[PDB]
Design a protein around this nucleic acid. Structure first.
Ligand SMILES: [Zn+2]
Ligand SMILES: [Zn+2]
Ligand SMILES: [Zn+2]
Lengths: 309, 39, 66, 133, 157, 37, 85, 176, 54, 167
RNA sequence: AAUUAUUAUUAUAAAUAUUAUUUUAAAAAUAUAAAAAUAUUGUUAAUAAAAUUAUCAAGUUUCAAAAGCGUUUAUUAAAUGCGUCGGUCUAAGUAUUAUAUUUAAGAUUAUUCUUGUAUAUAGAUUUUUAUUUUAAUUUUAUUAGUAGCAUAGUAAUUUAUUAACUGAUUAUUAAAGCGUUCCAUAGAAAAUUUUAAAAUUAUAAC
């Protein structure tokens, strides 16, 4: 196989990511793994298509529609691989709408259910078995104790035993950072914010998957943009001045000084962190400007977490 | 489809804007359905 | 299915205020079954649920009614 | 009209048992086939199975037509003719429901008769009626 | 557009909907129009559900096609609604017998849950694990640091 | 193009004025069952 | 201009029998009985169109090739006559 | 407008939209070429495309054979309106071995109500021409009695039915 | 003849008993137009029998 | 600079590049640019060269039972242009034998695939497996007695046919 | 749809019924056009996307300006839409992700500089410009430029036409286009050339 991921490119612009090894659609929809459910569109309590009230983290993005298609491929995902029982990658299924790759693992005590598929994994191989080393094999799900500084891990679980939440998107990877804390290990999440992950947490070793998503996936076809169907996102400056303060103006009015969606979203203002966890060390704001590498140099302790936020 | 017209108050202060707050006359003989409840 | 007082059988001819909206929609609308044939009310003279003979028994598949 | 009226219950009581004056019969008796309107029915039925003659006249017929109150089901029309008119040969009954006849009386109010239930019974050996002129 | 042919209407007419009936049910009840006290949200349908969905908490597969897409995973496990509590009745298995019963009954239901966890970690990581895979992390040279697996690996086994 | 101007819309605006039966069903003491005292 | 269960004929249709045009009933000579004919193609008009020559619509390129087989190559039989009597 | 979920079968012609597009007929023969040509288009119809994921796990191979159609008895037993989590196939069966019987959903019964009203229509047409091929068939048979009785009568009464002239204008075989 | 949606003329329907004329039912004036519901059912509707499965 | 540069697609059916893409390429001679354009096919294929009648040794392709000679439109006579091989003329099917043999439902959009003298449904005959349609299961939508097949195949000038203008 | 009205209510199925509502002796207009020699745009704001046809109903070509193909109550450089980019978000959803926006894809490039909103801020105001918002009045470099470009105008030159308030070209200080610019550009709207049935002037011609 050449390049287990391809920018298939049906039309010179339309570049969808075909992967050789991708299971044909027939071997995709699996009965006891397939969930279906209308997604509420953007309607929240009283219909009323609306986002979220300013302070909350339950998303009903105003511009959302056709979230669950009804005869789209929708198998559920594990996110909790088991520690050291061998796997067996049976096939590698690729759902367009959930851009994730995910391959069916046998997992060696019959459980034909495991999905998240780390980069450079091949089908019909056994994965969760360690080589001579501690657990340094691609695909092996490793507790954060067993990793060493500087090697990527994906699907890291935020709270130990509560399922993998961090670094699930394709090609993503949380890099270890060699902290000084007694029983905690700091990981450089891809958001350039570092977080004191408990060392007993479980992460899947390797990159995540399907590299060449970061770019090189471009639909530019009216039918094919039904991998991401969303509502129209109108100008905010053609919105019936009675309705939206940016409006009218006999021509192209540039826009008002302080941009606002309906309430406010001024360009770098609305930063909506309201509760920081005890584990958080430096938010994406505290690192946004340094670099990727300089954050990988230091050792991270509790004194690095800034007492004021 | 429906409307309370009062506008849902905070979940903590369940009642703002009684109709009396506006010097409203709601006699049963005047507009019919009037007589309030906080009474 | 109107039913006799003594008969333990339960029929759906209710007259509670919560149930008359559907008991008219049987007498004036009728039911259009998803099999293609129009049910209980299919023509002109709308039935009189209160002058039906009483429900005598639940239907069976093999015979008509137990 | 499906909606239950208040008065119609009250008018029911005053004839079932003298309502404002005579106290009610205990609810056990009311749930029983010995309650008078269930007893005046199980022993003194009140039915009007009128026969249409226009189909049973001088022309012989195997299918004499009746009219039975709207609330006489088929198998009761069997029981009826069997035990009251000795009719013992009824293989199939065929039942319509007809809006009672309507008209304007000479005054002008639309005086619509009660409704009934054509039930074309089908006797085995045909029946007839003679009319000598 | 200056021509409204108005023939594209008139096709597949809507049901009659007799809205006087709901207008009546309001008055034939104490309630007004159900003022935004509810006002509504689109209720789920039986089709879009997937029973046998390996979620659903396995008690609710008909109570749970409703309730939302964002709640029925959490719908708690309760009971068959006819399963009675474990009852400290006297019916002992047909052939377990005494001596075993006299011993086992001595152990209480934390004195036996504890024994069971040790035995199960011993049954796994025994013939079951030593037969093929390995279930305890190894050191520099590759020696099994801990004696038996860690309590989590067993839990998810 | 409304629909249903016919007689059923001429009764359902006249027979539904009939005042349904009223019974002051007072609230059921679910949690505090009184007869189990 | 009309065929058969297995054969053909020819006929110019008027206005009066426009009903029987598509499919007729006629004595099929490759048989001895009436059999339903069809309308394999047009062969002209029953009268003039205003301000137009005798052959206003023209028979066809098709019904001509049917004619050029019937009359056409009769060279098998200029014997027994050509046009005389 | 009479929500499609009311019709026994979803409607044949499906009207859409498109102020700037005026054509009644849905463009079939395009919805056909896709689907026939591309396997993926139509969701796998779980069973015939499950039974892999159950062969691969229990046999260590790709099935590499044509999967049986008609889902096995016992599959999709909690589902109620399958019709999508399947092909339009019926809900397979109970987990029994009794002979297959169509679970008479409101849909199956309607199809019975077509294949009887198809046989009804093709029967009311099939015997219009059967009596039409008596009326015209016997009208001709009778019309030739007419031209015969006219043929017999027009010889004794000598009406040659060929103009005011004698046959000497005919024998020339000119116009005259 | 069959149980089909159709349009009837009002005189065809026959009038109530008039002072001038008896009640002239739609049948006794148009005998060969009485629908034959044996012939309908036998031909047009699906019998319980043909789909009886249990 | 005529301004409204985005427009209605006003031409298109008023072109000569169009007049060549509207033709049909049927089984006639009709060199090109002479076939019919809007309906795509001429009405009343005249066939005086060969009479185009239903044969006597005729039988159902799918079922094989003899077919009524011509007194009826119970048979779906698909004359695939000049066929000869299926019968003296083209395939023959009673209206009720016109189903896919392998999957036993209707032949959707009526394109069938003659698998070893038993018409197979194209999708099954092609290996695909979606095996139940929506509208009518066991009876196709087809026309009867070639009436649906006369949109194509063998119009009047089926050959050189220059006997016309030659002496 | 105020009606016995424009009006196949297309859920289906079918294919040869000799199923049955339309006054009447004229020319004007007008709705309308069968027929028919020349002429081919001289008509006009402007010819050419303008019913049917068995005489089978279709204009070709060049240049300039112009994106997506969806979608709109006076229907389009309206508003969508993919990508890039900016900002936000690691205790409800995957930070090559999803929210919240500005733009528009493709191809070249994407300039100079800041007084206020925002951010950060230290009791607050007042102060305060890494990125973002808005700005640049002589920003004006690239780039196209009389252009839907405030007048000046028919811009001056060149063509083109017998006649050039057309249009295209050159350059080029454009009242104050300008980097989201510019190029590329297809069915559109123009300008030529050219051909051509609508009764286009001539022309009136039931
Ligand atoms: Zn013949
Ligand atoms: Zn056949
Ligand atoms: Zn098939």
């Amino acid at each position: 196989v050449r390049s287990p991921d391809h920018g298939y490119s049906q039309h010179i612009l339309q570049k969808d990511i075909w992967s050789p090894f991708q299971v044909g659609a027939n071997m995709m929809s699996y009965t006891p793994l397939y969930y279906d459910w209308k997604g509420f569109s953007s309607r929240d309590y009283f219909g009323h298509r609306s986002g979220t009230n300013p302070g909350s983290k339950v998303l009903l993005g105003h511009y959302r529609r056709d979230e669950v298609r009804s005869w789209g491929y929708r198998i559920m995902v594990n996110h909790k691989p088991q520690k050291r029982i061998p796997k067996w990658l049976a096939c590698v299924v690729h759902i367009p709408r959930k851009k994730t790759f995910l391959g069916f693992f046998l997992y060696a005590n019959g459980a034909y259910v495991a999905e998240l598929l780390t980069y450079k994994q091949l089908p019909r191989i056994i994965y969760n078995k360690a080589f001579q080393g501690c657990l340094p094999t691609i695909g092996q799900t490793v507790s954060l104790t067993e990793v060493t500084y500087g090697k990527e891990i994906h699907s890291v679980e935020m709270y130990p035993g509560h399922g993998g939440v961090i670094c699930r998107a394709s090609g993503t990877a949380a890099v270890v950072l060699r902290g000084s804390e007694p029983n905690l290990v700091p990981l450089l999440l891809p958001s350039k914010e570092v977080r004191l992950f408990d060392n007993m947490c479980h992460a899947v070793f390797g990159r995540r998957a399907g590299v060449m998503y970061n770019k090189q996936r471009n639909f530019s076809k009216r039918s094919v943009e039904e991998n991401m169907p969303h509502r129209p996102k109108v100008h905010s400056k053609t919105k019936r001045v009675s309705s939206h303060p940016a409006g009218g103006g006999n021509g192209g009015s540039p826009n008002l000084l302080t941009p606002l969606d309906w309430r406010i979203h001024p360009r770098n203002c609305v930063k909506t962190k309201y509760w920081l966890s005890g584990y958080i060390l430096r938010g994406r704001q505290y690192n946004r400007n340094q670099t990727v590498a300089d954050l990988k140099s230091k050792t991270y302790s509790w004194a690095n977490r800034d007492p004021v936020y | 489809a429906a409307t309370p017209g009062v506008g849902i108050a905070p979940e903590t202060t369940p009642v703002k804007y009684v109709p009396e707050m506006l010097n409203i006359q709601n006699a049963k003989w005047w507009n019919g359905r009037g007589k309030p409840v906080y009474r | 299915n109107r039913t006799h007082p003594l008969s333990k059988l339960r029929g759906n001819l209710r007259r509670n205020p919560s149930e008359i909206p559907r008991v008219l929609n049987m007498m004036i609308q009728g039911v259009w079954h998803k099999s293609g044939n129009k049910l209980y009310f299919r023509g002109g003279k709308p039935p009189n649920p209160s002058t039906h003979p009483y429900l005598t028994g639940e239907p069976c598949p093999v015979y008509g009614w137990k | 009209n499906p909606i239950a009226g208040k008065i119609g219950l009250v008018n029911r009581k005053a004839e079932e048992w003298g309502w404002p004056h005579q106290r009610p019969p205990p609810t056990g008796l009311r749930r029983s086939p010995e309650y008078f309107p269930f007893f005046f029915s199980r022993y003194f039925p009140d039915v009007e199975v009128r026969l249409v003659l226009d189909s049973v006249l001088n022309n012989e017929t195997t299918r004499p037509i009746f009219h039975i109150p709207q609330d006489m089901s088929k198998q009761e029309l069997v029981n009826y003719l069997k035990n009251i008119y000795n009719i013992d040969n009824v293989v199939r009954i065929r039942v319509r429901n007809m809006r009672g006849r309507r008209f304007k009386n000479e005054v002008g109010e639309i005086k619509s008769l009660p409704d009934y239930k054509v039930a074309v019974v089908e006797l085995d050996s045909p029946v007839s009626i003679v009319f000598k002129q | 557009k200056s021509q409204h042919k108005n023939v594209l209407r008139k096709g597949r007419p809507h049901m009659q909907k007799y809205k006087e009936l709901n207008r009546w049910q309001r008055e034939a009840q104490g309630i007004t129009k159900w003022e935004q006290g509810h006002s509504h949200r689109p209720q789920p349908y039986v089709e879009r559900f997937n029973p046998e969905g390996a979620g659903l908490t396995r008690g609710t597969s008909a109570y749970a096609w409703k309730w939302w897409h964002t709640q029925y995973p959490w719908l708690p496990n309760v009971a068959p609604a006819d399963y009675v509590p474990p009852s400290p009745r006297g019916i002992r298995p047909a052939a377990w017998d005494d001596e075993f019963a006299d011993v086992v009954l001595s152990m209480s239901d934390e004195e036996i849950q504890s024994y069971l966890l040790d035995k199960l970690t011993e049954v796994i990581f025994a013939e079951t694990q030593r037969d093929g895979y390995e279930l305890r992390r190894l050191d520099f040279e590759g020696k099994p640091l801990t004696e038996l697996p860690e309590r989590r690996i067993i839990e998810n086994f | 193009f409304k629909q249903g101007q016919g007689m059923f819309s001429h009764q359902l605006k006249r027979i539904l004025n009939k005042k349904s039966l009223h019974k002051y069903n007072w609230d059921p003491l679910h949690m505090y069952d009184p007869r189990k005292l | 201009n009309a065929c058969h269960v297995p054969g053909d004929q020819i006929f110019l249709v008027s206005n009066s029998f426009t009903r029987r045009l598509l499919t007729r009933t006629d004595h099929c000579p490759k048989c001895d009985r009436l059999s339903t004919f069809r309308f394999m193609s047009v062969s002209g008009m029953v009268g003039r169109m205003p301000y137009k020559p005798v052959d206003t619509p023209g028979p066809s390129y098709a019904t001509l090739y049917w004619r050029k087989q019937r009359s056409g190559k009769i060279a098998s039989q200029p014997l027994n006559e050509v046009c005389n009597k | 407008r009479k929500a499609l979920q009311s019709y026994p079968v979803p409607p044949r012609a499906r009207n859409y939209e498109r102020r700037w597009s005026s054509s009644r007929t849905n463009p079939y023969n395009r919805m056909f070429w896709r689907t026939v040509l591309n396997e993926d288009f139509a969701r796998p119809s779980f069973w015939v495309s499950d039974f892999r994921h159950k062969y691969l796990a229990k046999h260590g191979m790709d099935y590499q054979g044509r999967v049986p159609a008609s889902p096995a008895p016992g599959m999709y037993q909690g589902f109620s309106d399958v019709h999508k989590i399947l092909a339009n196939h019926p809900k397979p069966q109970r987990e029994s071995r009794h002979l297959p019987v169509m679970p008479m959903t409101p849909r199956v019964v309607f199809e019975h109500a077509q294949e009887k009203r198809i046989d009804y229509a093709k029967k009311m047409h099939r015997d219009r021409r059967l009596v039409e091929q008596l009326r015209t068939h016997e009208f001709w048979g009778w019309y030739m009695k007419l031209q015969r009785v006219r043929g017999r009568w027009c010889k004794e009464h000598g009406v040659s039915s060929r103009g005011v002239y004698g046959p000497a204008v005919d024998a020339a075989e000119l116009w005259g | 003849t069959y149980s089909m949606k159709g349009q009837r003329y009002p005189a065809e329907q026959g009038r109530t008993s008039r002072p001038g004329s008896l009640a002239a039912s739609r049948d006794r004036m148009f005998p060969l137009y009485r629908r034959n519901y044996k012939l309908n059912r036998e031909l047009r509707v699906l019998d319980h029998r043909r789909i009886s499965t249990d | 600079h005529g301004k409204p540069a985005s427009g209605h697609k006003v031409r298109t059916q008023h072109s000569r590049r169009w007049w060549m893409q509207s033709k049909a390429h049927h089984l006639t001679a009709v060199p090109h640019e002479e076939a019919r354009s809007r309906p795509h096919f001429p009405a009343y294929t005249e066939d005086v060269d060969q009479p185009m009648v239903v044969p006597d040794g005729v039988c159902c392709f799918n079922c094989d039972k003899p077919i009524d000679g011509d007194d009826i439109n119970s048979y779906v006579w698909v004359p695939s242009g000049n066929a000869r091989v299926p019968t003296t003329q083209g395939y023959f099917f009673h209206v009720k034998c016109f189903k896919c043999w392998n999957c036993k439902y209707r032949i959707i959009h009526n394109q069938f695939y003659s698998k070893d003298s038993r018409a197979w449904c194209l999708s099954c005959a092609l290996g695909r497996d979606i095996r139940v349609p929506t509208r009518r299961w066991h009876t196709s939508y087809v026309n009867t007695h070639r009436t649906g097949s006369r949109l194509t195949g063998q119009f009047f000038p089926r050959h050189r046919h220059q006997m016309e203008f030659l002496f």
